[model samples]
Target: MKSPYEAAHERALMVNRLQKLTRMLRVHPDPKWKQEQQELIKRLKK
Candidate 1:
């Protein structure tokens, strides 16, 4: 198992990447982008 600090660092990195992806997606006007955003939100909720 990873050390607690390492695990938290990994989670933070994951969230950062997700935030960037969301920001990039915001510029587009696609139906699929909406679905992708919803999925990202669902994951964040968990």
Candidate 2:
């Protein structure tokens, strides 16, 4: 049995992850940031 959920929670989590990543980029701007962000969006969508 699966518990019910809302997209807002997922959205919030994704937004938080993205913001955290943004802060991370300031100290560690790697060339992989765009690629990693795309991967993050795909994972969050799933």
Candidate 3:
């Protein structure tokens, strides 16, 4: 039901959001510890 580009775009969006969240963790370094952990948990599922 999805094209290759569409899937790639979705993966890119997920990776970008995860990257931003990870970077934010470097700065804020609080809730992200759990969020970052869960982010990785959910990342590969995408």
How large is the C-alpha RMSD of every model relative to the true structure?
3.0, 3.9, 2.8
> Of the pair 2 and 3, which is ahead by lDDT?
2
What residue runs in model 1 are displaced by over 4 Å at the alpha carbon?
A: 29-46
Clashing pairs in 3: none
Candidate 3 similarity to native, TM-score: 0.60
**Model 3 clash tally?**
0
The best-first sequence of candidates by lDDT reads 2, 3, 1
- Leading candidate by lDDT: 2
Model 2 residue 23 lDDT?
76
Clashes per candidate (backbone, < 3 Å): 0, 0, 0
Q: What is candidate 3's lDDT per residue for 1-46, written digit by digit as tens?
A: 9999988887887777777777777777777375664766496585
Which 10 consecutive residues of model 3 have the lowest summed lDDT?
32-41
Model 2: per-residue Cα lDDT at residue 6: 62
Candidate 1's TM-score: 0.52
Local lDDT at 46 for model 2: 72
